[PDB]
Write a protein that binds this ligand. Structure first.
Ligand SMILES: CC#CCOc1ccc(S(=O)(=O)N2CCSC(C)(C)[C@@H]2C(=O)NO)cc1
Ligand SMILES: [Zn+2]
Length: 259
């Protein structure tokens, strides 16, 4: 039965200078409110999900710290940063290579990252191939590096400890802002990875239903529209993975739900 004291994954949420400018209209309060609202709607999905299809419910996400980067991190030659002005590795792209950004962000946020269940990056960058978000997959194993619950690994190159309790979401795709309902689902799904779910097996009918049965679930490998019933829910495939992970990791790094 869930532990009321250990039922919530507290977030560090970062809005880099891009999201701030283009989603928050250059306003800190606007940016802050947007993401408080976003995470709150993502939390409705999680909290209301029964991972064992019965009483293993109530588990959610809350922001512990929001950080708004009103300004890019200035960079001289031969040095990089996730919230730097320029994209990496190609300068002449709208966006970073998604995997390198997640990697960069995790290195830069390392000191903060160790203090929280999860760290999440919000950005406004048009990644190639319609890519919208990325995150490390959690696991019930104690040594797992990735997903819920910070676990140090030393980077000899980085000259410090890193935590892969992280993920990111962009609200820009094919040259435009995505829909609010799309953004909610990008974050649900990345946090879903963090929480331990791999993508749904697309040829398995129970975990990838046809439209007439409510459509695909949120861990479907191709961005869902959010128009169909199942789009905002977790498949049984996702439940079984996330359940195991929560069952093991809640005692480690989950906290009490705050008002
Ligand atoms: C709208 C919506 C939705 C559900 O969440 C998603 C988040 C990212 C992607 S993705 O960026 O399109 N993509 C799918 C192919 S594998 C790759 C890593 C490229 C990525 C993903 O699954 N990230 O978690 C799709 C759905
Ligand atoms: Zn995914």
């Amino acid at each position: 039965d869930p532990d009321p004291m250990k039922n919530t994954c507290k977030l560090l949420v970062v809005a880099d200078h891009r999201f701030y400018r283009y989603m928050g209209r250059g306003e800190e309060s606007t940016t802050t409110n947007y993401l408080i609202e976003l995470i709150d709607r993502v939390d409705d999905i999680y909290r209301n999900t029964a991972w064992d299809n019965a009483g293993f419910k109530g588990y959610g996400i809350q922001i512990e710290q929001i950080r708004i980067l009103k300004s890019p991190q200035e960079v001289k030659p031969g040095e990089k940063h996730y919230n730097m002005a320029k994209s990496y590795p190609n300068e002449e792209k709208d966006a970073w290579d998604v995997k390198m950004l997640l990697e960069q962000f995790s290195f830069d946020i390392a000191e903060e990252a160790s203090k929280v269940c999860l760290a999440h990056l919000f950005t406004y960058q048009d990644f190639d191939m319609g890519t919208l978000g990325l995150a490390y997959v959690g696991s019930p194993r104690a040594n797992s590096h990735g997903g819920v619950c910070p676990k140090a690994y030393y980077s000899p190159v980085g000259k410090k400890n890193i935590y892969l309790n992280s993920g990111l979401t962009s609200t820009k795709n094919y040259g435009k802002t995505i829909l609010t309902k799309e953004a909610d689902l990008v974050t649900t799904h990345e946090l879903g990875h963090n929480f331990g779910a791999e993508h749904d097996p697309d040829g398995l009918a129970e975990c990838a239903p046809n439209e007439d049965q409510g459509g695909k679930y949120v861990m479907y490998p191709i961005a869902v529209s959010g128009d169909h019933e199942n789009n905002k829910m977790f498949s049984q495939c996702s439940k079984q993975s996330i359940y195991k992970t929560i069952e093991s990791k809640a005692q480690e790094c989950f906290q009490e739900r705050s008002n």
